[PDB]
Amino acid sequence: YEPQIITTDNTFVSGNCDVVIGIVNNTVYDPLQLELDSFKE
Amino acid sequence: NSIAIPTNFTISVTTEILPVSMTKTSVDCTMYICGDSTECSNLLLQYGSFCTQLKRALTGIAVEQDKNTQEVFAQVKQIYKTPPIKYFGGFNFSQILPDPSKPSKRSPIEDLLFNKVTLADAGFIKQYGDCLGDIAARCAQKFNGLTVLPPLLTDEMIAQYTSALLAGTITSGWTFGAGPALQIPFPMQMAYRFNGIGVTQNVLYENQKLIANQFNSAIGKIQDSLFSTPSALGKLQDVVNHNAQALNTLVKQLSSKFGAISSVLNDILSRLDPPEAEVQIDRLITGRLQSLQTYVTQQLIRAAEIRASANLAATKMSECVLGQSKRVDFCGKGYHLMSFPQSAPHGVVFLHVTYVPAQEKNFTTAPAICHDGKAHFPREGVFVSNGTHWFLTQRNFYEPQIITTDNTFVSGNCDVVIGIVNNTVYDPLQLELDSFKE
Amino acid sequence: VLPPLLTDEMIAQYTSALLAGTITSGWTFGAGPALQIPFPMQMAYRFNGIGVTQNVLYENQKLIANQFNSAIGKIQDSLFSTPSALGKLQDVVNHNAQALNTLVKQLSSKFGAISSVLNDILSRLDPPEAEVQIDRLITGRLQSLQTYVTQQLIRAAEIRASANLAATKMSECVLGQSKRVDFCGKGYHLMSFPQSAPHG
Amino acid sequence: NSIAIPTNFTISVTTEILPVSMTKTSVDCTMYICGDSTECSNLLLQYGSF
Amino acid sequence: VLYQGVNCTEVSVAIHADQLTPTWRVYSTGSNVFQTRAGCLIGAEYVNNSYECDIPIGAGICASYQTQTKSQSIIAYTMSLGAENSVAYSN
């Protein structure tokens, strides 16, 4: 057991939120999107 | 440049049958050679420790068979139970799990396996029977000194080990086999087994109903295949028949004369005075000694064969049922996903669940893509072309993806790779960072 | 002596089929339909399987091919030059010949009888004495047959174990890639090729 | 703090030789013990199923 | 002592008639005679409690030497296979 933040570097994307049985709603944090926002402002 | 890649798959269940144990025999030396005859027994004593050697050999065999059964089935430290819901993602295990409604608490498949095999000995107390039969019908019927010992583990107690093992693997996968049993949802155990054979988890989750239906159909096919084919359980019937034949031969040898006037010891003692009777008895003793040594030698050789088979069965249980094995053809034909044991008389039957590619299509491939003067190689998978565009796919399942800098790695220029082709290798950060300002 | 059920041509056909499957499709034909893959890409997979990236193979592909051709030539020269390499199979033949020759030689043994020839026993002795001498020869010959069969059963068990090991090697070395150290030869396993041999 | 890493490699081919089968034999028990002898065969019958 | 292949009734009758070839006898009272699948076991008290197998007898029946009630004796029992552990499986 070693919990980490769920990000787009830890997971991969295939398909939409329908076919998977038991999918749950949670935020996946993009590393770049946060960084890009810091680059802007 | 052509590579064929599966576009579909079938979940297949196959059956492997292995002997684990052989009937545990016991031979009564005095009764066989010198049945109820003091003079013959006294002559028999002049050959020394021969019986004692036979007794040790047969005791060692009986113990070895109990050892083989214990090693094969008693590999779990706790008896695991299944949940009362019996819902595992839509997978139907009613044909492999114990049926609570019938005596012995065996699975549908186990009762079929037990009904198919005919047991000639079925050791238990038989003295109560005595006569009133049409004929005695045996394999000595005890009377000539040859008996069969019961196993230490009963058929119900083997079924309990099988149930514990099935409950363990179904509810915790391979975790309990290497320490404590950790519960996991079944689709997540199978998804990890899929990862084990090189196919991603999303393939299983997207097609979960298809996979469950293929599994359930394959199990039904196993039940029908075993029911329909009377010779499916060949190896176990052969073991039973060989032990029955060895005992039938050993008893029938008692009717031979081996050079004596008569095969009946009491006739020799009745007709002749001691000094001649001793010679006729010595001839019969020699013949019986040869028959007993032949019988024991064959039982020891067969015991060694059974030991090797039992060791293989225990090895398969550990690597196929309590784990996942990457050894080809070890756990059935195809890529191994999981296995389920079933009890059978004198042995074990394994149901091996494998992933088999189906409906392949041939695409054009290339070792690498040259972009800005650099050779891009896959991190995982292979490159394919549908004739107009290049994609990255998995080796075991067609799934086209855009070739990007997050999926490939770069090493060296494009001049060194013999089969390299020209295609655009996208870079997600650059398009957005170029998108970010301009 | 009974012939084998599968003739040498049939064994050669199985070996050829296994080589064609392995070369054209690698490990694929042992677990689904055979799927063609370019050989250098099959090797790239195998290299990744042993922890070596695909670019090592591709940058040095001609070095690897030359080392392969040299090693195969060395195998042919090694087997030709050293007759003892195949001793494991030659012993199987030689032991069998010895066992059969021994059993025949046992017919000349007297086992305590005045003569080894049944016709001599019957010609010179009255039935009673001839019966005693013949019964003795029968006992000696039965003992020789029991010894021969017991030895054949023990060797059969040894051959069975060897055949089971060979079957495991075919499935794991030829029809796949093994991670068992020194199972499929010394070094990290890349691939194997079967060849038929008499009795093995 | 010292680690050795290969800078080159060799592709090696080795040979493993395994027996698969033995010569299949068959024995005529009566002919071997009592070849072309009626009297011997008649005594051989007293040894039963051997 | 385990008498293989026979009924306990037959053994008790042979004992009362003094027809058995061994000249020794095992002291026998009620509760000390237990019918097994292997044969008739005389000289061990059968109990309901299962335990790990120590001295195997056969057909699931094992025996051991243990302190009972308040007094050590040989007992016979049905073999225990292990502790029960129900896995908390959930979706």
Ligand SMILES: *[C@@H]1O[C@H](CO)[C@@H](O[C@@H]2O[C@H](CO)[C@@H](O[C@@H]3O[C@H](CO)[C@@H](O)[C@H](O)[C@@H]3O)[C@H](O)[C@H]2NC(C)=O)[C@H](O)[C@H]1NC(C)=O
């Ligand atoms: C898991 O699979 C088993 C079969 O492998 C399912 O049991 C089957 O259930 C159906 C419907 O309840 C049974 O059909 C009915 O059978 C009776 C027999 O008398 C018949 O009269 C009815 O008209 C109907 O045909 C089927 O026989 C039965 N099979 C067995 C072997 O029990 C079980 O329901 C499945 N469970 C889940 C959760 O999917």
Ligand SMILES: *[C@@H]1O[C@H](CO)[C@@H](O[C@@H]2O[C@H](CO)[C@@H](O[C@@H]3O[C@H](CO)[C@@H](O)[C@H](O)[C@@H]3O)[C@H](O)[C@H]2NC(C)=O)[C@H](O)[C@H]1NC(C)=O
């Ligand atoms: C890694 O090792 C291999 C050998 O296992 C190196 O390749 C070998 O390099 C030598 C020297 O360049 C070659 O020797 C030369 O061969 C030619 C053949 O005509 C001969 O005329 C020369 O006189 C000399 O003997 C050798 O053949 C070659 N082997 C192969 C199979 O190509 C390789 O360069 C090494 N790599 C590194 C990075 O050290």
Ligand SMILES: *[C@@H]1O[C@H](CO)[C@@H](O[C@@H]2O[C@H](CO)[C@@H](O)[C@H](O)[C@H]2NC(C)=O)[C@H](O)[C@H]1NC(C)=O
């Ligand atoms: C996860 O979030 C999505 C929305 O992004 C949810 O989908 C909505 O669910 C409500 C339920 O009342 C519907 O009325 C909406 O029409 C749905 N919208 C869409 C776009 O599908 C989804 O239900 C959420 N899942 C969970 C488990 O909370």
Ligand SMILES: *[C@@H]1O[C@H](CO)[C@@H](O[C@@H]2O[C@H](CO)[C@@H](O)[C@H](O)[C@H]2NC(C)=O)[C@H](O)[C@H]1NC(C)=O
């Ligand atoms: C090869 O794949 C590409 C992309 O998957 C195909 O092109 C797409 O075709 C769909 C219609 O099926 C269009 O909606 C997309 O806009 C197309 N994308 C591009 C980038 O062209 C292409 O047709 C496929 N070719 C073959 C022979 O299968």
Ligand SMILES: *[C@@H]1O[C@H](CO)[C@@H](O[C@@H]2O[C@H](CO)[C@@H](O)[C@H](O)[C@H]2NC(C)=O)[C@H](O)[C@H]1NC(C)=O
């Ligand atoms: C991939 O593209 C490069 C250019 O980006 C090609 O390189 C050119 O090849 C032609 C001959 O085909 C030469 O005349 C040019 O001088 C080359 N230019 C450079 C910059 O290398 C390369 O040949 C292409 N490869 C394929 C397989 O089409």
Ligand SMILES: *[C@@H]1O[C@H](CO)[C@@H](O)[C@H](O)[C@H]1NC(C)=O
């Ligand atoms: C695909 O396989 C079939 C097999 O008959 C072959 O005829 C066809 O040419 C192949 N196509 C490609 C592109 O390799």
Ligand SMILES: *[C@@H]1O[C@H](CO)[C@@H](O)[C@H](O)[C@H]1NC(C)=O
């Ligand atoms: C794969 O085969 C199954 C067989 O039932 C079928 O239902 C499914 O649609 C097939 N999928 C594809 C992508 O061909």
Ligand SMILES: *[C@@H]1O[C@H](CO)[C@@H](O)[C@H](O)[C@H]1NC(C)=O
């Ligand atoms: C012993 O004999 C009785 C006679 O009624 C019988 O009921 C019982 O089943 C027998 N036991 C065995 C083990 O045969």
Ligand SMILES: *[C@@H]1O[C@H](CO)[C@@H](O)[C@H](O)[C@H]1NC(C)=O
């Ligand atoms: C075992 O338990 C059953 C329960 O009904 C009982 O009848 C039986 O007498 C018990 N045996 C012993 C030896 O206590």
Ligand SMILES: *[C@@H]1O[C@H](CO)[C@@H](O)[C@H](O)[C@H]1NC(C)=O
């Ligand atoms: C699991 O899902 C099934 C869906 O039919 C449901 O019936 C069952 O009660 C669920 N179990 C748990 C523990 O949530």
